[PDB]
Amino acid sequence: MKEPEIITVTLKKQNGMGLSIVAAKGAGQDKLGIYVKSVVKGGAADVDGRLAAGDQLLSVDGRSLVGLSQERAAELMTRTSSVVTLEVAKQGA
């Protein structure tokens, strides 16, 4: 069985979020997680070096995006305060 690495990271907003995301399902998960399609060079997450491309997102600022659409997650990420906590999962398919 595949065993990824999920960790909650805390980053701030410099000029939005330069990274692609997707709301789909997978294995051992009958919901829709917010996966990271890619990260635009220059973004706070890219420059820092925490999350990577082809990852999964569960919790955001204390909340949980388990079973939400790409719009709901993306819209929620933009409607956040200065600091934004995100729990990424080290995986890939």
CATH superfamily ID and name for 1-93? PDZ domain (2.30.42.10)
CA distance 79 to 73: 10
Which sign does the torsion angle of CA 82, 38, 45, 84 carry? positive
- Dihedral pair phi/psi, residue 34, rounded to 5°: -90, 95
Amino acid at 66: V
Q: How far is CA 26 from CA 45, 48, 56, 57, 93, in A?
A: 24, 28, 10, 12, 9
Residues 6+ apart with CB under 8 A from 13: 44, 80, 82, 84
Tell me the two tokens of residue 77: 């990420």
For residue 19, give the H/E element and its range: strand 19-24
Domain ranges of the chain: 1-93
User: Left, alpha or beta for 49 (phi > 0: left; psi -120 to 50: alpha)?
Assistant: left
Nearest to 56 by CA among 18, 1, 6: 6
